């Protein structure tokens, strides 16, 4: 709704981890972006626990107890718990609500005993879909909103979702090196959907005195990343994955335009670009989220993180204790290193060290390096009012950034270089006018993708 047309920071060099321009106060005495990074632990219940509401509540009480116990045994000052709903917690609003209430109760107990700072994030499933297609504005919509407000009324401090707007056209395009289809699905359909939902979520957050935290392009940009996989895969050019990431930034940006205040969702790798624009805090994930997946920017993503996440891990036993204890201890220590750097005014060198670790590992890391991310940010805000053109700007800026890198020390394969050159040309041939582009794609994808329903986006 209220679009960004300038940057929150004067230059990339002002950005650092654990501080952001507009901090968020939430939960039990916690502050985010306020001069300390925070570990944010994620977890998935075992398949059996999903059988009933009571089994699910119990599993999450074991998770929460195990986590808070570990934090106080190792002396950590602060922790965030993120509960990513299984579908049944969102489809039945009161289920997620009762899990939220049960978790908050154990956290309040540890906060009263020890004074440990903490907050709870609930991430509602995007349930606006059936077996045949997306139903972004249908019957499930009202249930979607009830899931948010119920969890907000019963203990959740931060509200997030990984929304599905444009996912269907994305899925078709990403498999086909259809760059304009990437632009339309992520930058356009995604942006439009994001504005609808985030407007409502923020209203709910305000009414219930909780925080409208943010979204992630996980359904599109992360999918491109996983299909791309490691350095030796052959399923998606990494030079195209990175372009998807560039476009994801003005899409994810819309949450904040529409009332969200951060921290953004861990799996929003694009959050570095978003932070450079909004000056809001963001959670990141990388080397300590390998329990969920491999990535090629393990250290770099820490560069300006405010919260540090393990993404997800099943809840089960390891020699060192419970899965959620093992990873929360590692996240917490990573945050201790960063906090020691802040307290001693050595954050900037450490931020640089983190960035440089991965700058040259892959075009996907290269672009996300805080200086290059800020550059992408600049390219979006110069047409900030225009959801299409800002996204197109980002995509081409991305291409320029990678080309420059490749002319220095970024070592791309011939194949990667070609895919990049093809996509830049595809992007430069597009019209500047949004309507022109929106209309051509509407009729193109209506035709090429039969599961694509324009009513999902108010068309």
């Amino acid at each position: 709704a209220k679009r960004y047309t300038s940057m929150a920071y004067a230059n990339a060099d002002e950005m650092t981890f654990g501080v952001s321009k507009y901090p968020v106060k939430a939960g039990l005495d916690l502050e985010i972006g306020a001069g300390y990074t925070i570990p944010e632990i994620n977890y998935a219940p075992r398949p059996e626990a999903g059988a009933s509401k009571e089994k699910l509540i119990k599993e999450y009480e074991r998770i929460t107890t195990d986590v808070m116990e570990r934090m106080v045994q190792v002396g950590f000052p602060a922790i965030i718990l993120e509960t990513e709903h299984v579908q049944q917690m969102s489809n039945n609003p009161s289920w997620g609500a009762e899990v939220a209430h049960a978790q908050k109760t154990i956290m309040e107990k540890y906060h009263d005993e020890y004074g440990i700072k903490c907050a709870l994030r609930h991430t509602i499933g995007d349930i606006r879909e059936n077996r045949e297609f997306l139903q972004l504005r249908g019957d499930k919509y009202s249930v979607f909103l009830e899931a948010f407000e119920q969890c907000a009324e019963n203990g959740a401090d931060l509200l997030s979702v990984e929304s599905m707007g444009g996912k269907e056209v994305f899925d078709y395009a990403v498999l086909r090196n259809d760059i304009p289809g990437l632009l339309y699905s992520i930058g356009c359909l995604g942006s439009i959907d994001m504005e609808l939902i985030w407007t409502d979520i923020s209203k709910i957050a305000k009414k219930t005195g909780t925080i409208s935290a943010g979204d992630t392009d996980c359904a599109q940009a992360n999918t491109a990343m996983f299909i791309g996989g490691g350095l030796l895969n052959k399923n998606l050019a990494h030079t195209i994955a990175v372009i998807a990431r560039a476009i994801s930034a003005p899409r994810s940006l819309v949450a904040y335009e529409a009332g969200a205040v951060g921290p953004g969702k861990d799996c929003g790798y694009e959050n570095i670009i978003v932070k450079a624009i909004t000056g809001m805090p963001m959670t990141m994930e990388g080397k300590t989220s390998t329990c969920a997946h491999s990535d090629v920017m393990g250290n770099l993503v820490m560069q300006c993180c405010d919260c540090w996440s393990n993404e997800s891990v099943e809840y089960h036993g390891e020699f060192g204790g419970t899965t959620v204890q093992c990873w929360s201890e590692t996240l917490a220590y990573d945050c201790a290193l960063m906090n020691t750097a802040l307290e001693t005014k050595n954050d900037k060198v450490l931020r640089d060290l983190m960035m440089l670790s991965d700058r040259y590992r892959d075009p996907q890391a290269y672009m996300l390096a805080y200086d290059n991310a800020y550059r992408v940010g600049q390219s979006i805000v110069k047409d900030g009012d225009n959801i299409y053109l800002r996204a197109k700007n980002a995509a081409i800026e991305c291409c320029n950034i990678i080309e420059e890198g490749a002319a220095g020390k970024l070592e791309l394969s011939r194949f990667e270089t070609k895919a990049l050159a093809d996509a830049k040309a595809a992007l430069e041939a597009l019209p500047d006018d949004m309507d022109k582009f929106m209309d051509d794609c509407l009729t193109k994808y209506k035709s090429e993708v039969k599961v694509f329903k324009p009513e999902n986006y108010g068309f």
């Binding site: 498999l175 086909r176 399923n235 040259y360 200086d371 020390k409 070592e411």
Partner: protein, 258 residues
């Protein structure tokens, strides 16, 4: 901000993919493999490029300077495709290049389906599905695309597919092979229902199981189960049914061992 010297970077990490890339460009590599049959040529090249118009254009001229109405599928489309598949296995091209190519071929097949009535011939039917409760499409689609692109008829049962529906389709279509894909722990056990309900109706065909949430040890507790990790493993196992092996134990022996 900090930067590396060339020597430092070289010490810190290695993009292993760069040094293993073959010298030839995809185009040059394709050129070494195309048939020089003048008539079949511009079709094979058109498939490789994912350029559907040129596939049609190239098919119109070949049935006019000769015949072969339904044959052009095997003589021109499946030869063009055999080039794409080869280069994909050798890693000189990537998945989307195969997808674009299969799209251009499918439109070239259905254009033959209009100058025929003859009904085309395939290496057999394969039924594909994603375990019920699971929306994860991609891996199935890449199994779908590879199969078709290797010369198989594919009835793709779609996403949240509920067993009863699978049973019913192995009946309607009497396939040489069924495939399954699961990605959530909350979901892999729909391979149970299906394996049991194929047995509880007297069906004995290979059940190629794959998916992120799935490994070689999980599919072995099923008599029909055969693990494939790569999507490129689906047609490779389907070809072992053209060879005669229906026995799962004998398949496991020449395909398991990870």
């Amino acid at each position: 901000m900090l930067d590396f010297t060339e020597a430092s970077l070289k010490k810190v990490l290695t993009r292993y993919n760069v040094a293993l890339e073959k010298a030839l460009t995809p185009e040059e590599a394709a050129e070494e493999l195309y048939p020089k049959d003048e008539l079949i040529y511009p079709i094979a090249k058109a498939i490789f490029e994912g350029e559907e118009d040129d596939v049609v254009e190239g098919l119109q001229a070949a049935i006019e300077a000769g015949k072969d109405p339904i044959d052009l599928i095997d003589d021109a489309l499946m030869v063009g495709m055999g080039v794409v598949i080869r280069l994909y296995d050798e890693g000189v091209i990537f998945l989307p290049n195969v997808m674009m190519s299969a799209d251009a071929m499918l439109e070239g097949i259905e254009y033959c389906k209009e100058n025929s009535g003859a009904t085309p011939k395939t290496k057999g039917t394969v039924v594909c599905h994603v375990a019920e409760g699971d929306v994860h499409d991609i891996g199935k689609n890449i199994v779908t695309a590879l199969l078709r692109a290797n010369g198989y008829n594919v009835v793709d049962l779609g996403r949240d597919v509920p067993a009863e529906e699978v049973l019913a389709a192995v009946q309607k279509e009497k396939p040489i092979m069924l495939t399954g894909t699961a990605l959530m722990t909350t979901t892999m056990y729909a391979f149970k229902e299906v394996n049991d309900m194929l047995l509880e109706n007297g069906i004995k065909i290979p059940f190629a199981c794959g998916g992120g949430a799935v490994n070689q040890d999980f599919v072995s507790q099923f008599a029909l189960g055969v693990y494939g990790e790569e999507a490129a493993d689906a047609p490779k196992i389907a070809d072992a049914i053209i060879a005669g092996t229906t026995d799962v134990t004998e398949l496991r022996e020449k395909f398991h061992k990870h």
